[PDB]
Design a binder for this molecule. Sequence first.
Ligand SMILES: Nc1ncnc2c1ncn2[C@H]1O[C@H](CO)[C@@H](O)[C@H]1O
Ligand SMILES: Nc1ncnc2c1ncn2[C@H]1O[C@H](CO)[C@@H](O)[C@H]1O
Lengths: 577, 577
Amino acid sequence: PHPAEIVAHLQPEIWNKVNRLLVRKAISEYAHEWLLEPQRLGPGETPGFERFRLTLADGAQYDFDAQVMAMRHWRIPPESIVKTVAGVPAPLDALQFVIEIRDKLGLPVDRLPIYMDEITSTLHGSAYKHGRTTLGAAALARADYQTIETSMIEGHPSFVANNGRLGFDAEDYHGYAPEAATPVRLMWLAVHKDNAHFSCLSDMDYDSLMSEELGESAVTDFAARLREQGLHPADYYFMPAHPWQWFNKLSLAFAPYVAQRKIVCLGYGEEQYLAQQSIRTFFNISRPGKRYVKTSLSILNMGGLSPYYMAGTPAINEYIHDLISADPWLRANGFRILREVASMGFRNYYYEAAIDTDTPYKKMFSALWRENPLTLIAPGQNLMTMAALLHVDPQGRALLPELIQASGLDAGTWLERYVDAYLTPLIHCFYAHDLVFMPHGENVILVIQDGVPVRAFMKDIAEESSILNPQVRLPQAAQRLAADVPEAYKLLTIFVDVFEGYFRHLTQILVETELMPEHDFWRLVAGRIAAYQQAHPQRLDKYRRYDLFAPDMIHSCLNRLQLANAPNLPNPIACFR
Amino acid sequence: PHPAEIVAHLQPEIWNKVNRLLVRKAISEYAHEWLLEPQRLGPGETPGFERFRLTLADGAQYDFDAQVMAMRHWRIPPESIVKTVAGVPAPLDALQFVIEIRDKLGLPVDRLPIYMDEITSTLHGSAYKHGRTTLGAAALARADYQTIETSMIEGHPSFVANNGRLGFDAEDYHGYAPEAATPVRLMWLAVHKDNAHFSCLSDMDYDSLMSEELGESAVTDFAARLREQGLHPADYYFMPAHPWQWFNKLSLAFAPYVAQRKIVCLGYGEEQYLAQQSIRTFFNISRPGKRYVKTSLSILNMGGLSPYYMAGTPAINEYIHDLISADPWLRANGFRILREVASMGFRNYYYEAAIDTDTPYKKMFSALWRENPLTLIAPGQNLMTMAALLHVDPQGRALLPELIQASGLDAGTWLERYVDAYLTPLIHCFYAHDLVFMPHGENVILVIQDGVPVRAFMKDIAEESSILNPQVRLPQAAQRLAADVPEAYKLLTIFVDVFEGYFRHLTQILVETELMPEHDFWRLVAGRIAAYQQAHPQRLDKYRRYDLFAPDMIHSCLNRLQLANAPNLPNPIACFR
Ligand SMILES: Nc1ncnc2c1ncn2[C@H]1O[C@H](CO)[C@@H](O)[C@H]1O
Ligand SMILES: Nc1ncnc2c1ncn2[C@H]1O[C@H](CO)[C@@H](O)[C@H]1O
């Protein structure tokens, strides 16, 4: 393999294209979070926009068109952005922009080059994604679950430096990046019960999980392998790992355990998987209806996987699932979690003895198995990550209109179906159960039926969910699920993760594609919320206490939070109270 | 390739062996630096030693034999060390020891796991080196230059965490670790003159260097390659890089430059190299008398390579070489530097604009060529790293006695030859020229003639050398060479880098192998120094001002300095004044 081929995707014209796209996002999102305060100049190059200026690193100047939409959202046509340096035209360069605003960023000058490296890696991935052979909007909107999953481009829509994958070298990138869509086999390891522990749903056990996941031959073959090298299979579980994790972290940092045979490399599994958008979660493409496998993966990307939550994970999941199943409204709506049914943690007592506090060092060797949603839908239904609604192909065409065209519904009707499948159950979960998730594009999977959103699956459960009520009666293993939260913070999941985190980006698509005016979308959302409250009038106490129609709401600045690693925003639905 | 094979060297018995060796070193070196204060218990298991105790992490206890030699040196027989935890026998475990002394180490609890990872990697390498097929002491003492180079085991003899190679994953390790002795081909890159700059000796040029290093075919083929992809060779130099650096750092962090064709990957060179003990320096094994190539390599090991010194490197080297050549005493002794004859730096203007201060980020893409010493010795001479004198094979046999046996000389005579080849020229360089180096085991190469040390080569010149006289008249390019140093610090090179850094470990070998008593070695050294001063009586002013026979000397604590990343010691030669 010629050593140049790993960066063949890095060419001048494509680099320039993705840089312009990222400068737009950086300007939009930093402005949104008050890191940038653009100065209005006059009317825009495009009619209906106004022109703004940023005057930066003593020389650098960026003029652009913007329309400032709800929640202080800067809608910026990428082609409108004009950089000059002391009166001279200069190409848009996203790394250079971040440098020009380094003082405004507030980065200790030793985390700065790290953040620069994340921007660069984000660009490098973006170049690859825009250059690769891929389906356009029309075709993608009609494509299967996994084709859609691996064809996503944007990543998290608010984080500028959202796609770092720092730790993957150039070859790792092509084997393991979700966007390379290269089948991956998991690494199987025998893990000593001195170090390893397993948890699962009450109706299952380790042996039945393995029977299902590996089969009798593979499991027999593993025990034999161990016994054949003089070891006692009775002392071990079998545990999957990301191959990168094995070569980069476990064979090395965990050398004492390998040396002492507390970890034994058994080799690659037979079945092939595709990396999901989360990178560390894998979908089995070899065989039907098998669970996802989520592994620990020590790369930097905005922020591994811990065994101390791997003790209580299935129990948290069993509780939430039984709760949702026993609720007649949720039953009727069809909203459902995908259970993390079994988890396993290898505990590194060296790191645990050295560090008493929370650390990524305790989270380097864990696995869980997650329910496969294909098994839970009907013929004539398909699945897609909710991130797909925000998708724009390399030609600049949005997926959403193509999906709505295929459904045969007007945008209003389609959007109502979507809101009641996605937003309404979250609101019910909060009002009825104080139960909250992390409801972003990557954690939500929509069940689609001939173009129409019918219902939603929620994933990423044990690590993201809370019951906002310390009095809730929880099984002993699930206790962490309960949380005691300031009043102002209870509705954050809607205000922060739904409205500002996801809907803010959706309406920009709605407006660019002329599917619906912004005011019409917020009115639609307010109406779905109001219709819910009317159908469940007995929780008026809670509707008034936690007012979704309050004039303003807490603004969490995601990038500023990543950079550290604001005043209230007006509520877009306030005027519909 | 089975994924388990990369850690086949990690087995229980070998792991235990290398752990015991590292615990010994950690105890010895930390005690030496006052991090540990062992408490005398009584007489040793071995007669002539005393027994000491360390009482640690509330439970852990280590008893051991020691003999405290000059410069507060703790000579500790590895097999004498006995660990108990609350009265119960426990295996020696070096990672565990470091944890047990974490409070004494004074590490912010976020650098701690990093230091732990360095210890672990040091152990992992040590396991490999002790397990590999290798020459014993007798054979090694008679072996060729490169066999000796790749067969070194210890590394830096004072640093506990001396062999980290953090950044190499498990496969990288087998391709690129000096001890794996796997031939390496360099990666060739076309580097744009917008970014790249070249310096060399006044009697040479870029084109003659390349003619010699690559040849006309390879250089022609490179220009053609560039021209063939639509580029202009007139705009570029050709630059070598470590293949790991390309896959891990340059193709990724330098993506904008790759994308903009400021860096073009040309592929692997035809000629094969072996990694030297420095890891980033390569010796050409394909063809006779070619230069070493030193490349930038962004791994963690105790502390890359910078282009801002790559501008002045050959000029510093040309100055020092002409100085040594013009000096009749140095001429007569035969001491010589190996010139860094040409250097090249690629400048990353993104990092340079973001960070005004010294950083590893500015040092990621550089190369230099160094003079090959094989070209500078006679038939019947051989070369060996001075680190070889400290070498102990996996059977516990020392190389030094075997070398002395082969020479036919008594230890006293051999040692005198050695001191006058190594130490005396350093002393002259200081007294006559205020010229100092970094004279450790890895920077010094001895010319050996049928077992006898005849003279020494010094390498690592531009980055390590200083003229301790701000008044020295230096060519404009070499100005950094001059230094203005506190009085107490002028003789550091002898007191710190020679006596405490290297001789302290040598006498432990001399004593373990019964080659010479410690007092006899110091008397020998004092005599060589005194004989030098008598032969050059006109610098008595300087002998008195910088007294090598002062009662005590500054003690630099290397590990404490690495950990952060003491009172004076008695001078071992004071009593010979
Ligand atoms: N559309 C998306 N929305 C939210 N997070 C995303 C999205 N795509 C990828 N991610 C994230 O998934 C992981 C967060 O757990 C990270 O890898 C981060 O990239
Ligand atoms: N014997 C030695 N003496 C001093 N430094 C050594 C020795 N062996 C290896 N090194 C060091 O060489 C480099 C220091 O520039 C590091 O890779 C470090 O390991």
